[PDB]
Design a protein around this nucleic acid. Structure first.
Lengths: 30, 415, 365, 35, 166, 225, 91, 138
RNA sequence: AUCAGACACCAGAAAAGGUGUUAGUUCAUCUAGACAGCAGGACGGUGGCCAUGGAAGUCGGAAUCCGCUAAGGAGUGUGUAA
RNA sequence: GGAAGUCGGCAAAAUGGGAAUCGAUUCCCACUGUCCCUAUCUACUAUCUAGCGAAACCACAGCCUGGGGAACGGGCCAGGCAAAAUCAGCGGGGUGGCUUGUGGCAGCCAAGCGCGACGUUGCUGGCUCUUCCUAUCAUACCGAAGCAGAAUUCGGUAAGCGUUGGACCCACUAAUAGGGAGCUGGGUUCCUACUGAUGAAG
RNA sequence: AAUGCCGCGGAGCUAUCAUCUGCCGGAUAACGGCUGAACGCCUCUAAGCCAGAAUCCGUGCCAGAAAGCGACGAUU
RNA sequence: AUGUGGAACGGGGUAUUGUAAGCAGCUGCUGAGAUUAAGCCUUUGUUCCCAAGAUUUG
């Protein structure tokens, strides 16, 4: 059983949005 | 003036934490950017308003619970003067009220700007700008809140005085037997110690005599304690109970006590003082005796002799200044009063009860005490109805005779 | 969005489904816990709701607002003729539950209990239990073997008893047969008690004793299909859930009234059963003109407080309370003062015709 | 006020069952049991 | 009860029998209690606990440091200051006093805004008197007329905090 | 003069009635009230744990003296039989068919003279004189009709309202042939009868009665000896 | 003010306690195995729990102290209770 | 504390026949004539249920017609008579022919001195002061 | 891990907290006896001076010196009206 | 009991009426199932039966949870599940892992890497409805506080159970806590679900 | 006489407009402790243990798998 | 499916209403008359009817 309050599995928009904005973070720190 | 009913004042940090925690817990928490701008504005407006309401609610509670020094009996007002510096207390209370108005002004200002919030963020910071200003306002009265809490704690300790009632103020030299007289007269447990000025503050104790209750107020011996003692007798319809050490066993000279009493006579005027000769068992006094109002009653403090007589004399002085043959049964003339400890005392139904299960379980037998030719039938059931008639309508001690008379009559009719 | 004005739920979720009971006879879904410290005793009885009346009793309730006053209470009268024990069932405890290992029947079975096995007694050739009677007469050693099996392996002993419905003034001829668990004693003791009680009648005088607290269980009156108004007390896109009140069956559900007090266990052969120490006035529990829609009570009867589920002439099961509960209401004695037996078929005004005749004039008839 | 699920209420209810308040039920059962 | 009645009770009857040993045990196990609190609690209470433990930790590090060396609708959406007025400037968003902080003096004075010269974001807002970030506003300096630049955003912060041009 | 509370109520006259030959206490509450009465009158007069019409206001429902007792119409037969069995033979009991059921409120009666509600029925007055064997007089107390509730009677003393005038004080004393004092009971409550029950040799008042009031009742009732 | 009443049954394996701050209740404990409770006459109102298992004796002590607990009263003034005074061995 | 204030005994459940907005007769000699019911003490949280009172219940009352100084106080009132029939616990059904009540303080002693008309014994038992100052108790 | 992890630059919360564990880096004393533990000493000028009802190191204002040493701080806290 | 209902005497009963202000409004009296609070009675329909006998609509159909980048859907993914044939009801179904409790300017430090953290100092919409969440108003149990007692404040576990009646106001109440997922007023000029009822069958 | 109008009106239905009924076993959370290390002291915790909330799980109560089952009776 | 069998009426009890028509002389017959199970109780009362037709079942 999950035994959690928040699901450990992520949606495809959410997982795609990390690589969208993680790269921009490296752009900003550059 | 029971000053115990004042709610306890939190320090500035707990006050802010309680207010902010209440705002978080009692108001809605979740909002999304996609919501209508009216709902966003209303959302943050509620938090600012709710936080304003919690702060004033607490601050008003302080401002109302504290006693208004001007509206109270000048005995207590001057007592609060010597202890708390009315000006400092008044400044502290005014600072909170000025804070309260400031908390209201900031909230009204930020609610007004929130009506024009265009994005979820610009409302978010007005709320953050709001609550921070509300908090920074409160943080500035750290001294005032701390001061009021200390005042609160000592206020709850003060005795509940009532100058309206009959009183008898007891003042004199420190540890000069006044504490012993107060302890012997009133039920108050006044501590007696070799240390001088053991009674730091006043001690009020009630005493019942002459079908009335008198509130004897013992004052500090004679500083702040001396000032409080003076103000205690300053405004009080009572009589002085000065106790002078006759044998000087209290450590104070008799002449010094007489001189102090003469100096304090200006405030002790319009009262019937007492020239108590304390420590009797253990010249200058002529001038004091020349006043006449002082009652020269010997007080054998070591032997505890004369305390009751002195108290009775003081109470009397204060009061002055302010055919049907009842056939009682013979058993009544020799009835032993029901006192529990004695063995000869009979039992009561209360004791039968605690033995037989106590309140709610014991069934009292109502029938158990019937005057009756037998104790056995004492639980019988008397027939009430029979064949449409009550048995009661027919209960007659000679009813057998009416039945026999009748027999003869029916025997006549059949014949 | 939240509900603005809230109220408690209009129904009870613990009593649904509101479907018709699959039985007419009250089922015992729980028998009182057994104990070997106490030897044998029964735990249930089967009666018929004749009718209900009201009584006056002196209330000896310590601490009450009406301590030692005369109180009026409604009472239900259930006729309880003695029931004949005709069988014993052994139950073995298994990791899957209580399982009926075997059953032993008495040799002579009355037509009362034989009618239970048929939907039409007249067309049948009455062949039931005939070969069982033959083998009982031939060899009793076989029957001794099943009883040995019951007392050796089984952990719960129950007796099959049927009510003598013939004695009651009921138009039904089938007897109601049920199992009463023999609580108390060892399994051998229960088996013996069943053996010496075969074919003999056990009466309510031996089951209950006029003061204890019992659970009365039965099927309620049928009100037919009803809308949400009287079935349930009713004043986002989704699908309708089970919690939403709906229209359907109202009535004829299996119910259990707890904590019923017997005010009196009267004997049918006695003619003083409706008379008390404060009343005299020889009378019977049957009201003047007979019970409405039931008849005349001529056998042993039980008078319970309050009301019991189901209409008149329906079968009720009376079981001993599962759990001891020593509320002083459950522990106090009862001393009846007066019982009402006026005509319930209308506004009755007289208790018995005898005492009505003195008040009324000489009727021409 | 505490409900019936209260562990305290269960405890002194058990205390009542532990004493003579249930002994009136034992001899009550024994009477019919013997007769 | 009069004045310090509880220590009169303490003096006359003593304190509770187990108080000293119970408080010793509680103080001893407080070390484990703090760590248990830090590892169990979640949410705001954890977060305030985290921030207050950081504050106290930095504080105790500083005093042990101090111990050391001593031993050694056409409407305007921005706040404005007071045909051509085609848009609506709410009197609510309008402001009249600003907190101008002197650079050299380092003193913040709340003074009225005499006027606004130009808004760097939009010169059109200068006519309407809209105060934005970096806007130039002139205020009276008699109590200290001088110009200043807005150091914050009046729309968001609400209070017009500006830095004097001196 | 003693202080007692029925349950936690200051009105003991309502829940009890006391005479010179018997005592009546309410039933079904706490017998601590019965316990207190027995502690002072158990060895002198019988104490009856009685109710009147299934009710506990027996003090204000029944009026009596050392000779006889009266009960209202609402008195049940069982309770009347209970009272007769409890009380001794030389005491007589009477039902009253009075419209004014509150006998304890309409009749204030001592062993020799009784003063009654002005609008009492003639038949009630005649049977009162027959049973109580006292002279009956129709008059109001301080302009107030409830004589039994607003006035307490004993053989040697009595109390009335503090609202009565001095001339009313003198007239009432002259018509009663007993010393009478204007006073109050239970700390300012002008229901003297409801707050006080007195026989010829002892007095009971509520626990909230002041010390001054107790001294007044003791002074008028001469109970120090 | 209220003396505490102590009763010992089944040679000290069950302790009944009465009148703790004027209680009408009967607080009953059953001692853990290996523990016997006695009342010593050397000092008044002295309870002694003797046994072999330290855990059983000391857990019995904790049970007594916690069951005789003051509720809703100010403990800075209300000092009534039962407390462990000395811990040691029989010899 | 007003709710069961100085009751000196519990009341049995009685049929409610005087809800709020009721207009009902004053029974004391204090001078008031008519009373208007504003609220009843001891009513919980029942949705849409109109607050109601029975004999011996204490209500909030306004003197519609009466002496002016008797007015301008929402004064506690004790309902002493009720027209709706109710079951006395002994079994008999009772109903007085008019709805009557008395003006009383929150503590439980009225401003009046004598009650005109019959008094329910339930009222007289929860309120010993009314019983003390009642003329006929039925 | 009494709401573990399988996540995917662990990038939003993110700054950090933990008497949880395993590894390291830099400084410390240690058979001239290490840390801890129990036994004891922890002083005398001196109750240093203003400050006070009462303050003796410990309500409170600058230090805070000395005879002895192996060490006893005008004193780390509790506590005492003192 | 007598408009307490509703935005409101809509509709009935009093037979509709008495006085005021500008037909309308208000007031007092009067009446009444609008309401507390629904219950009962009658006729018709609905139900079944004999006869007759349509139409709209129709890719195919028919359970829910999480995901399927979106539009989440019924078809796809992973699960819960899943047993013929039916009857009568009622109508449900035709866009940040956001966000929350702590404001803006300047200076002083300074763990450390010109910044520099915490600190520190300077100033001005309402009527009824099923369920869920806890972020708890009350009830249960605890800790702390000048908490003597009573009453009370704050905080913890806790959503089991309650959280009203009237025109922000005034009462009751232990309390009148906050939110998520059939209807009307003033304001701008088939099938499936749910609920009951049968029902072939080892 | 389309229930002409009125009074009473059994039976049935019904009314917090009437009456009755609504119960006990474990496991825990906050929290209070026992023994006891880690760390030669200490420690409610690490291994274990005790007490402990209207909480959770059962008992009780309702339904009875129409594809879960047992015993008994007869068997053309 | 021949039985303490059932049904239709009848009597009695119990209830509802209120004292009938008629005979008469408001009064008496006359607390009478009418109704009473259609979801009231009872029946040595009379009469009547049933030991039958079909269907499915190893």
């Amino acid at each position: 059983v999950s035994l959690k309050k928040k699901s450990k599995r992520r949606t495809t928009r959410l997982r795609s949005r990390i690589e969208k904005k993680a790269a921009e973070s490296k752009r900003k720190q550059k | 003036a029971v000053f115990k009913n004042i709610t306890p004042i939190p320090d500035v940090n707990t006050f802010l934490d309680v207010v902010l925690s209440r705002t978080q817990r009692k108001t809605p928490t979740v909002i999304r950017s996609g919501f209508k701008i009216s709902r966003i504005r209303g959302f943050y407006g509620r938090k600012v308003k709710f936080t304003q309401d919690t702060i004033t609610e607490k601050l008003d509670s302080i401002l109302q619970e504290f006693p208004k020094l001007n509206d109270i009996h000048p005995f207590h007002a001057d007592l609060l003067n010597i202890l708390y510096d009315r000006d400092h207390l008044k400044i502290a209370l005014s600072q909170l009220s000025t804070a309260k108005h400031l908390v209201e002004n900031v909230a009204r200002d930020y609610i007004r700007l929130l009506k024009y919030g265009d994005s979820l963020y610009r409302c978010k910071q007005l709320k953050r700008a709001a609550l921070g200003r509300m908090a920074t306002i409160i943080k500035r009265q750290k001294s005032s809140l701390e001061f009021l809490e200390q005042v609160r704690q000592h206020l709850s300790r003060l005795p509940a005085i009532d100058p309206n009632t009959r009183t008898l103020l007891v003042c004199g030299y420190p540890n000069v037997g006044k504490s012993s007289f107060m302890n012997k007269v009133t039920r108050a447990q006044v501590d007696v110690q070799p240390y001088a000025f053991t009674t730091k503050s006043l001690f009020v104790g009630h005493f019942d005599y002459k079908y009335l209750r008198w509130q004897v107020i013992d004052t500090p011996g004679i500083n702040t304690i001396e000032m409080q003692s003076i103000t205690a007798m300053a405004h009080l319809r009572s009589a002085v109970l000065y106790f002078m050490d006759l044998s000087e066993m209290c450590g104070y000279s008799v002449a010094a006590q007489v001189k102090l009493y003469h100096s304090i006579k200006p405030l002790f005027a319009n009262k019937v003082t007492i020239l108590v000769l304390n420590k009797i068992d253990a010249e200058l006094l002529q001038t004091i005796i020349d006043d006449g109002n002082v009652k020269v009653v010997q007080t054998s403090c070591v032997q505890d002799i004369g305390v009751m007589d002195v108290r009775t004399t003081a109470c009397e002085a204060l009061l002055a200044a302010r055919a049907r043959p009842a056939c009682i049964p013979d058993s009544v003339k020799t009835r032993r009063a029901y006192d529990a400890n004695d063995p000869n005392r009979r039992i009561l139904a209360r004791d039968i009860e605690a033995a037989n299960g106590g309140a709610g379980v014991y069934n009292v037998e109502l029938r158990d005490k019937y005057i009756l030719q037998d104790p056995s039938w004492k639980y019988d059931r008397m027939p009430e109805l029979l064949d449409g008639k009550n048995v009661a309508d027919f209960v007659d001690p000679e009813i057998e005779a009416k039945l026999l008379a009748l027999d003869e009559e029916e025997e006549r009719l059949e014949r | 969005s939240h509900c603005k004005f809230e109220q408690p739920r209009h129904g009870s979720l613990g009593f649904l489904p509101r479907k018709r009971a699959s039985r007419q006879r009250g089922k015992v879904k729980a028998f009182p816990k057994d104990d070997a410290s106490k030897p044998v005793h029964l735990t249930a009885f089967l009666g018929y709701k004749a009718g209900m009346t009201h009584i006056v009793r002196d209330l000896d309730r310590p601490g009450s607002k009406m301590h030692k006053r005369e109180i009026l209470e409604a009472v239900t009268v259930i006729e309880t003729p003695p029931m004949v024990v005709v069988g014993v069932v052994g139950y073995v405890e298994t990791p899957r539950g209580l399982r009926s290992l075997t059953t032993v029947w008495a040799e002579h079975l009355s037509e009362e209990v034989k009618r239970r096995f048929y939907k039409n007694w007249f067309k049948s050739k009455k062949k039931a239990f005939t070969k069982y009677a033959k083998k009982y007469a031939e060899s009793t050693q076989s029957i001794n073997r099943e009883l040995e099996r019951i007392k050796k392996y089984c952990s719960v002993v129950r007796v099959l008893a049927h009510t003598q419905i013939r004695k009651t003034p009921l138009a039904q001829k089938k007897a109601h047969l049920m199992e009463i668990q023999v609580n108390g004693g060892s399994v051998a003791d229960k088996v013996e008690w069943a053996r010496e009680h075969f074919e003999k009648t056990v009466d309510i005088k031996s089951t209950f004793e006029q003061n204890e607290m019992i659970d009365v269980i039965g099927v309620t009156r049928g009100k037919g299909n009803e809308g949400t108004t009287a079935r349930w007390g009713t004043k986002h896109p989704a699908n309708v859930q089970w919690t939403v009140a709906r229209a359907g069956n109202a009535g004829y559900m299996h119910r259990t009234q707890l904590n019923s007090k017997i005010y009196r266990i009267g004997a049918g052969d006695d003619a003083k059963n409706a008379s008390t120490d404060f009343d005299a006035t020889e009378k019977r529990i049957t009201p003047m003109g007979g019970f409405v829609r039931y008849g005349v009570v001529e056998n042993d009867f039980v008078m319970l407080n309050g009301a019991t589920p189901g209409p008149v002439k329906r079968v009720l099961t009376l079981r001993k309370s599962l759990l001891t509960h020593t509320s002083r209401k459950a522990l106090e004695p009862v001393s009846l003062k007066w019982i009402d037996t006026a005509s319930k078929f209308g506004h009755g005004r007289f208790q018995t015709p005898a005492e009505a005749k003195q008040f009324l004039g000489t009727l021409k008839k | 006020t505490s409900g019936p699920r209260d562990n305290n209420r269960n405890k002194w209810a058990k205390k009542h069952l532990k004493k003579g308040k249930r002994a009136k039920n034992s001899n009550f059962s024994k009477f019919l049991k013997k007769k | 009860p009069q004045n310090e009645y509880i220590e009169e009770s303490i003096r006359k009857h003593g304190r509770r029998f187990d108080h000293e040993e119970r408080k010793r045990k509680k103080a001893a196990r407080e070390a484990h209690d703090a760590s248990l609190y830090a590892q169990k609690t979640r949410g705001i209470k954890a977060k305030l606990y985290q921030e207050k433990r950081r504050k106290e930790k930095i504080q105790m590090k500083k005093t042990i440091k101090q111990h050391e060396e001593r031993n050694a609708k056409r409407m305007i959406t921005k706040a404005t200051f007071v045909k051509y007025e085609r848009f609506i400037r709410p009197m609510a968003l309008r402001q009249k006093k600003a907190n101008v902080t002197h650079k050299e003096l380092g003193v913040t004075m709340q003074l009225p805004i005499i006027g606004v010269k130009k808004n760097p974001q939009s010169p059109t807002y200068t006519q309407l008197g809209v105060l934005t970030k970096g806007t130039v506003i002139e205020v009276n300096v008699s109590e200290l007329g001088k110009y200043a630049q807005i150091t914050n955003n009046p729309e968001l912060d609400g209070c017009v905090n500006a830095l004097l041009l001196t | 003069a003693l202080r007692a509370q029925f349950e936690n109520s200051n009105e003991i006259g309502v829940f009890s009635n006391l005479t010179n030959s018997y005592a009546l206490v309410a039933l079904g509450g706490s017998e601590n009230f019965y316990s207190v009465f027995e502690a002072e009158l158990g060895d002198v007069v019988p104490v009856v744990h009685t109710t009147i019409g299934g009710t506990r206001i027996i003090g204000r429902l029944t009026c009596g003296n050392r000779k006889g007792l009266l009960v209202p119409s609402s008195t049940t037969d069982n309770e009347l039989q209970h009272l007769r069995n409890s009380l001794p033979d030389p005491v007589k009991i009477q039902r009253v068919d009075e419209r004014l059921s509150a006998l304890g409120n309409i009749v204030a009666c001592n062993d020799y003279v009784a003063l009654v509600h002005p609008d009492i029925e003639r038949e009630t007055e005649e049977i009162i004189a027959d049973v109580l064997d006292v002279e009956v007089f129709r008059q109001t107390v301080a302009g107030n009709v409830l004589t039994g509730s607003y006035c307490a009677l004993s053989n040697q003393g009595a109390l009335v309202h503090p609202r009565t005038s001095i001339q009313e004080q003198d007239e009432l004393s002259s018509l009663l042939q007993v010393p009478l004092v204007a006073g109050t009971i239970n700390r300012g409550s002008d229901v003297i009868g409801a707050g006080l029950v007195v026989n010829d040799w002892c007095a009971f008042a509520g626990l909230d009665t002041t010390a001054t009031e107790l001294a007044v009742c003791e002074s008028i009732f001469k109970l120090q000896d | 003010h209220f003396p505490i009443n102590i009763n010992l049954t089944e040679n000290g394996t069950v302790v009944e306690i009465r009148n703790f701050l004027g209680e009408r209740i009967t607080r009953v404990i059953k001692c853990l195995p290996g523990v016997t409770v006695s009342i010593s006459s050397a000092v008044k109102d002295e309870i002694i729990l003797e046994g072999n298992s330290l855990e059983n004796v000391s857990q019995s002590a904790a049970n007594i102290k916690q069951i005789c607990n003051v509720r809703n009263k100010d403990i800075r003034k209300f000092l009534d209770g039962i407390y462990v005074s000395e811990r040691g061995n029989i010899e | 504390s007003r709710g069961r204030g100085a009751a000196s005994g519990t009341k049995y459940r009685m049929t409610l026949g005087l809800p709020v907005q009721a207009i009902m007769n004053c029974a004391d000699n204090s001078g008031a004539k008519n009373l208007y019911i504003v609220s009843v003490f001891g009513t919980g949280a029942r949705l849409n249920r109109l607050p109601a009172a029975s004999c011996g219940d204490m209500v909030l009352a306004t003197v519609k017609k009466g002496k002016p100084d008797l007015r301008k106080k929402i004064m506690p009132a004790i309902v002493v008579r009720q027209r709706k029939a109710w079951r006395r616990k002994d079994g008999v059904y009772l109903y007085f022919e008019d709805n009557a009540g008395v003006i009383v303080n929150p503590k439980g002693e009225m401003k009046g001195s004598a009650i005109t008309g019959p008094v329910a014994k339930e009222c007289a038992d929860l309120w010993p002061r009314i019983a003390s100052n009642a003329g006929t108790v039925v």
